[PDB]
Amino acid sequence: ILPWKWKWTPWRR
Ligand SMILES: *[C@@H]1O[C@H](CO)[C@@H](O)[C@H](O)[C@H]1O
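Above are the sequence and the beta-D-glucopyranose SMILES. Below is the predicted complex in structure-token form.
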């Protein structure tokens, strides 16, 4: 299992 957690989509610059 891996709970990726970062909203849904990564908040990069
Ligand atoms: C999730 O993906 C959307 C795609 O538009 C982006 O705007 C969000 O900032 C990101 O977390």
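The CA atoms of residues 3 and 10 lie 13 Å apart.
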